[PDB]
Paper text:
The CagXct crystal structure was solved by MR and subjected to isotropic B-factor twin refinement in REFMAC5 at 1.4 Å resolution after the true space group had been established as monoclinic P21 with a β angle close to 90°, with the crystal forming a nonmerohedral twin. It contains two protein monomers with all residues built into the electron density, one PEG and two 2-propanol molecules and 129 waters. The two monomers of CagXct comprising the asymmetric unit can be superimposed with an r.m.s.d. of 0.38 Å over all 103 Cα atoms. To maintain structural similarity, many buried protein residues which form the protein core of TraO are conserved or substituted by residues with similar properties in CagX. Most amino-acid residues of strand β1, which runs antiparallel to TraN in TraO, are not conserved in CagX; however, the main chains of the matching residues of both these T4S proteins have the same conformation and solvent accessibility. Thus, it appears likely that the β-sheet interaction between TraO and TraN is reproduced in the Cag–CagT interface. Interestingly, one of the 2-propanol molecules binds to the main-chain N atom of the Ramachandran plot outlier Asp481 in monomer A in the CagXct structure. The main-chain N atom of the equivalent Gly258 in TraO forms a hydrogen bond to the main-chain O atom of Gly364 in TraF, with the positions of Gly364 and the 2-propanol ligand O atoms overlapping.
Author numbering: 1 to 103
């Protein structure tokens, strides 16, 4: 068992609701993005300090069934993610970044 940082929020662009996760948390090593079965799967990118984007090391975790969602494990902790599928964009903010997962 590892205390989780659940302190994330999403900021969808227009015509972007169809790619939004329902649950996002990190355990200090990995960031987990849970999507409803009905949601289309975006790519997940991280914002770098330069303002530029990077790919992540992301993949479906078949084992995880939490909340009836489709879960992706990202092998990184970051302050900002961009979820992209064609013109659809959701910015994810880790408000708990640099903080301990006690609170």
């Amino acid at each position: 068992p590892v205390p989780r940082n659940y302190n994330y929020y999403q900021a969808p662009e227009k015509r972007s609701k169809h790619i939004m996760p329902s649950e996002i948390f990190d355990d200090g090593t990995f960031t987990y993005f849970g999507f409803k079965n009905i949601t289309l799967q975006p790519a997940i990118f991280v914002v770098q300090p330069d303002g530029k984007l990077s790919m992540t090391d992301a993949a479906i975790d078949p084992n995880m069934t939490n909340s009836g969602l489709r879960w992706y494990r990202v092998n990184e902790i970051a302050e900002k993610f961009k979820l992209i599928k064609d013109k659809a964009l959701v910015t994810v903010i880790n408000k708990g970044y640099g903080k301990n997962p006690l609170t």
